[PDB]
Amino acid sequence: MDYRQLHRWDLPPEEAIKVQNELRKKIKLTPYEGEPEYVAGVALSFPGKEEGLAVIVVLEYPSFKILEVVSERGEITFPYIPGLLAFREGPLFLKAWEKLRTKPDVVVFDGQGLAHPRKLGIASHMGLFIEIPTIGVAKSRLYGTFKMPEDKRCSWSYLYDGEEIIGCVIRTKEGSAPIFVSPGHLMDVESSKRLIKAFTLPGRRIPEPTRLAHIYTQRLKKG
Protein backbone atom coordinates (compact mmCIF):
# COMPACT_ATOMS: atom_id res chain seq x y z
CA MET A 1 0.00 0.00 0.00
CA ASP A 2 1.16 3.52 -0.76
CA TYR A 3 2.03 6.24 1.72
CA ARG A 4 3.75 9.62 1.85
CA GLN A 5 7.37 9.83 3.00
CA LEU A 6 7.21 13.18 4.80
CA HIS A 7 10.77 13.19 6.15
CA ARG A 8 13.90 11.19 7.02
CA TRP A 9 13.82 8.64 9.83
CA ASP A 10 17.53 8.51 10.66
CA LEU A 11 17.59 11.60 12.91
CA PRO A 12 19.11 12.40 16.32
CA PRO A 13 16.55 12.71 19.18
CA GLU A 14 16.61 16.52 19.09
CA GLU A 15 15.84 16.85 15.38
CA ALA A 16 13.13 14.21 15.65
CA ILE A 17 11.31 16.27 18.29
CA LYS A 18 11.40 19.26 15.95
CA VAL A 19 9.93 17.13 13.17
CA GLN A 20 7.09 16.26 15.53
CA ASN A 21 6.43 19.89 16.48
CA GLU A 22 6.10 20.68 12.78
CA LEU A 23 4.05 17.63 11.81
CA ARG A 24 1.53 18.32 14.59
CA LYS A 25 0.29 21.24 12.49
CA LYS A 26 -0.83 18.88 9.73
CA ILE A 27 -3.08 16.85 12.01
CA LYS A 28 -6.80 16.97 11.27
CA LEU A 29 -9.06 16.02 14.18
CA THR A 30 -12.11 15.33 12.04
CA PRO A 31 -15.07 13.12 12.98
CA TYR A 32 -15.31 9.61 11.59
CA GLU A 33 -18.99 9.31 10.69
CA GLY A 34 -20.17 5.89 9.59
CA GLU A 35 -19.54 2.17 9.85
CA PRO A 36 -16.06 1.10 8.71
CA GLU A 37 -15.69 -2.08 6.70
CA TYR A 38 -11.94 -2.75 6.73
CA VAL A 39 -10.18 -2.21 10.09
CA ALA A 40 -6.42 -2.71 10.55
CA GLY A 41 -4.35 -3.40 13.65
CA VAL A 42 -0.57 -3.04 13.93
CA ALA A 43 1.86 -4.61 16.38
CA LEU A 44 5.61 -5.13 16.77
CA SER A 45 7.77 -7.75 18.44
CA PHE A 46 11.56 -7.90 18.74
CA PRO A 47 13.26 -11.21 17.81
CA GLY A 48 16.58 -9.59 18.76
CA LYS A 49 17.84 -6.36 20.34
CA GLU A 50 18.18 -4.91 16.86
CA GLU A 51 15.60 -6.91 14.94
CA GLY A 52 11.92 -6.06 14.98
CA LEU A 53 8.94 -7.76 13.35
CA ALA A 54 5.97 -5.61 12.36
CA VAL A 55 2.60 -7.22 11.70
CA ILE A 56 -0.46 -5.63 10.14
CA VAL A 57 -3.82 -7.37 10.23
CA VAL A 58 -6.90 -6.25 8.31
CA LEU A 59 -10.27 -7.29 9.69
CA GLU A 60 -13.74 -7.08 8.24
CA TYR A 61 -16.19 -5.18 10.42
CA PRO A 62 -18.48 -6.04 12.08
CA SER A 63 -17.79 -9.76 11.48
CA PHE A 64 -14.21 -9.39 12.73
CA LYS A 65 -13.05 -11.95 10.17
CA ILE A 66 -9.39 -11.81 9.11
CA LEU A 67 -9.10 -10.61 5.51
CA GLU A 68 -5.33 -10.12 5.19
CA VAL A 69 -2.07 -10.34 7.12
CA VAL A 70 1.39 -9.09 6.14
CA SER A 71 4.65 -8.62 8.03
CA GLU A 72 8.20 -7.37 7.82
CA ARG A 73 11.30 -8.23 9.83
CA GLY A 74 14.03 -5.61 9.81
CA GLU A 75 16.89 -3.88 11.55
CA ILE A 76 15.79 -1.55 14.36
CA THR A 77 18.48 0.85 15.51
CA PHE A 78 16.55 3.67 17.16
CA PRO A 79 16.33 3.26 20.97
CA TYR A 80 13.03 3.34 22.80
CA ILE A 81 12.51 6.83 24.23
CA PRO A 82 9.14 7.89 25.64
CA GLY A 83 7.56 10.29 23.16
CA LEU A 84 9.60 9.07 20.19
CA LEU A 85 8.11 5.62 19.56
CA ALA A 86 7.55 6.51 15.89
CA PHE A 87 11.27 6.84 15.25
CA ARG A 88 11.84 3.32 16.53
CA GLU A 89 8.90 1.38 15.11
CA GLY A 90 7.61 3.69 12.40
CA PRO A 91 10.08 2.68 9.64
CA LEU A 92 9.49 -1.09 9.96
CA PHE A 93 5.70 -0.66 10.07
CA LEU A 94 5.80 1.36 6.83
CA LYS A 95 7.87 -1.47 5.35
CA ALA A 96 5.05 -3.88 6.17
CA TRP A 97 2.51 -1.30 4.96
CA GLU A 98 4.17 -1.36 1.52
CA LYS A 99 3.08 -5.03 1.28
CA LEU A 100 -0.54 -4.48 2.30
CA ARG A 101 -3.05 -4.92 -0.51
CA THR A 102 -6.31 -3.95 1.23
CA LYS A 103 -6.87 -0.23 1.89
CA PRO A 104 -8.14 0.04 5.50
CA ASP A 105 -10.80 2.60 6.45
CA VAL A 106 -9.10 2.98 9.81
CA VAL A 107 -5.88 1.74 11.39
CA VAL A 108 -5.39 1.17 15.11
CA PHE A 109 -1.90 1.34 16.63
CA ASP A 110 -0.41 0.34 19.96
CA GLY A 111 0.57 3.53 21.74
CA GLN A 112 -0.69 7.09 21.89
CA GLY A 113 -1.99 9.34 19.19
CA LEU A 114 -3.08 12.78 20.36
CA ALA A 115 -2.31 11.99 24.05
CA HIS A 116 1.36 12.82 23.53
CA PRO A 117 3.65 15.61 24.93
CA ARG A 118 3.87 17.31 21.53
CA LYS A 119 0.43 16.18 20.35
CA LEU A 120 1.85 13.64 17.91
CA GLY A 121 2.14 10.03 19.06
CA ILE A 122 2.96 7.14 16.72
CA ALA A 123 -0.71 6.78 15.71
CA SER A 124 -0.94 10.46 14.68
CA HIS A 125 2.44 10.40 12.97
CA MET A 126 1.69 7.25 10.97
CA GLY A 127 -1.69 8.75 10.09
CA LEU A 128 0.01 11.65 8.31
CA PHE A 129 2.14 9.20 6.33
CA ILE A 130 -0.67 6.84 5.26
CA GLU A 131 -3.36 9.53 5.03
CA ILE A 132 -6.04 7.32 6.55
CA PRO A 133 -8.00 7.65 9.83
CA THR A 134 -5.89 6.42 12.76
CA ILE A 135 -6.41 5.66 16.46
CA GLY A 136 -3.87 5.12 19.21
CA VAL A 137 -4.82 2.54 21.87
CA ALA A 138 -2.30 2.38 24.73
CA LYS A 139 -2.08 -0.02 27.69
CA SER A 140 -0.57 2.77 29.78
CA ARG A 141 -0.50 6.55 30.11
CA LEU A 142 2.16 8.61 28.43
CA TYR A 143 0.71 12.12 28.76
CA GLY A 144 -2.29 13.86 30.28
CA THR A 145 -4.27 13.69 33.49
CA PHE A 146 -7.44 11.73 34.20
CA LYS A 147 -9.78 10.38 36.85
CA MET A 148 -9.65 6.59 37.02
CA PRO A 149 -12.97 5.29 35.70
CA GLU A 150 -14.85 2.85 37.94
CA ASP A 151 -14.54 -0.93 37.48
CA LYS A 152 -17.65 -1.35 35.30
CA ARG A 153 -17.64 -2.79 31.77
CA CYS A 154 -17.74 0.39 29.71
CA SER A 155 -17.11 2.95 32.42
CA TRP A 156 -14.86 5.68 31.09
CA SER A 157 -13.51 9.17 31.58
CA TYR A 158 -11.76 11.82 29.50
CA LEU A 159 -7.98 12.19 29.36
CA TYR A 160 -6.97 15.84 29.62
CA ASP A 161 -4.10 18.16 28.82
CA GLY A 162 -5.07 20.81 31.30
CA GLU A 163 -8.38 21.86 29.77
CA GLU A 164 -8.15 20.16 26.36
CA ILE A 165 -9.61 16.69 25.93
CA ILE A 166 -6.96 14.58 24.16
CA GLY A 167 -8.54 11.16 24.48
CA CYS A 168 -10.30 8.89 26.92
CA VAL A 169 -9.60 6.12 29.40
CA ILE A 170 -11.88 3.10 28.96
CA ARG A 171 -12.52 0.12 31.23
CA THR A 172 -12.96 -2.35 28.37
CA LYS A 173 -12.90 -5.23 30.87
CA GLU A 174 -13.77 -5.67 34.55
CA GLY A 175 -10.79 -6.68 36.64
CA SER A 176 -8.41 -5.31 34.03
CA ALA A 177 -6.65 -1.93 33.92
CA PRO A 178 -8.26 0.51 31.48
CA ILE A 179 -6.83 1.29 28.05
CA PHE A 180 -5.94 4.78 26.81
CA VAL A 181 -7.62 5.88 23.59
CA SER A 182 -6.63 8.96 21.59
CA PRO A 183 -7.35 9.99 17.98
CA GLY A 184 -4.52 9.90 15.49
CA HIS A 185 -5.08 11.64 12.16
CA LEU A 186 -8.45 12.21 10.46
CA MET A 187 -10.11 11.26 13.75
CA ASP A 188 -11.39 12.90 16.91
CA VAL A 189 -11.76 11.98 20.57
CA GLU A 190 -15.45 11.16 20.24
CA SER A 191 -15.09 8.99 17.15
CA SER A 192 -12.08 7.09 18.50
CA LYS A 193 -13.99 6.14 21.67
CA ARG A 194 -17.00 4.97 19.65
CA LEU A 195 -14.88 2.91 17.27
CA ILE A 196 -12.62 1.36 19.88
CA LYS A 197 -15.63 0.50 22.01
CA ALA A 198 -17.02 -1.15 18.87
CA PHE A 199 -13.79 -3.02 18.16
CA THR A 200 -13.57 -4.57 21.63
CA LEU A 201 -15.55 -7.72 22.39
CA PRO A 202 -16.91 -8.74 25.84
CA GLY A 203 -14.30 -10.55 27.91
CA ARG A 204 -11.53 -8.71 26.07
CA ARG A 205 -9.49 -5.69 27.19
CA ILE A 206 -7.78 -5.03 23.86
CA PRO A 207 -9.61 -4.24 20.58
CA GLU A 208 -9.61 -7.11 18.03
CA PRO A 209 -7.41 -5.28 15.48
CA THR A 210 -4.34 -4.87 17.67
CA ARG A 211 -5.11 -7.95 19.78
CA LEU A 212 -5.00 -10.25 16.76
CA ALA A 213 -1.98 -8.40 15.38
CA HIS A 214 -0.04 -8.89 18.62
CA ILE A 215 -0.79 -12.61 18.53
CA TYR A 216 0.61 -12.94 15.01
CA THR A 217 3.61 -10.86 16.03
CA GLN A 218 4.36 -13.48 18.70
CA ARG A 219 3.57 -16.53 16.57
CA LEU A 220 5.81 -15.41 13.69
CA LYS A 221 8.56 -14.65 16.22
CA LYS A 222 8.78 -18.46 16.37
CA GLY A 223 6.73 -20.30 13.75
List of residues contacting DNA (CB under 7 A):
13-14, 17, 43-46, 48-49, 79-83, 85, 110-111, 117-118, 138-142, 173, 175-177, 203-205, 211, 214-215, 221
Nearest distance from residue 79's CB to DNA, in Å?
3
Give 103 or 204: the residue with its C-beta nearer to DNA.
Answer: 204
- 104, amino acid identity: P
Looking at residue 3, the DSSP 8-state letter turns out to be -
Torsion sign across C-alpha atoms 180, 127, 9, 214: positive
Nearest residue to 139 via CA among 180, 84, 193: 180
Nearest distance from residue 40's CB to DNA, in Å?
15
Nearest distance from residue 21's CB to DNA, in Å?
8
Q: 3-class DSSP state for residue 134?
A: strand
Give 6 or 81: the residue with its C-beta nearer to DNA.
Answer: 81
Give 34 or 79: the residue with its C-beta nearer to DNA.
Answer: 79
Give 34 or 175: the residue with its C-beta nearer to DNA.
Answer: 175
- 59, amino acid identity: L
Give 105 or 110: the residue with its C-beta nearer to DNA.
Answer: 110
Nearest distance from residue 33's CB to DNA, in Å?
27
Nearest residue to 116 via CA among 190, 183, 41: 183
Is 130:97 a contact under the CB 8 Å cutoff? yes
Nearest distance from residue 124's CB to DNA, in Å?
14
Nearest distance from residue 34's CB to DNA, in Å?
27
Exposure pattern of 79-113 as b/e (b: 16+ CB <10 Å)? Answer: eeeebbbbbbbbbbbbbbbeebebebbbbbbbbbb
Give 62 or 82: the residue with its C-beta nearer to DNA.
Answer: 82
- Do the bridges between strand 65-75 and strand 38-48 make them parallel or antiparallel, or are there none, so unpaired? unpaired
Query: Distance between terminal CA atoms of the chain?
Result: 25
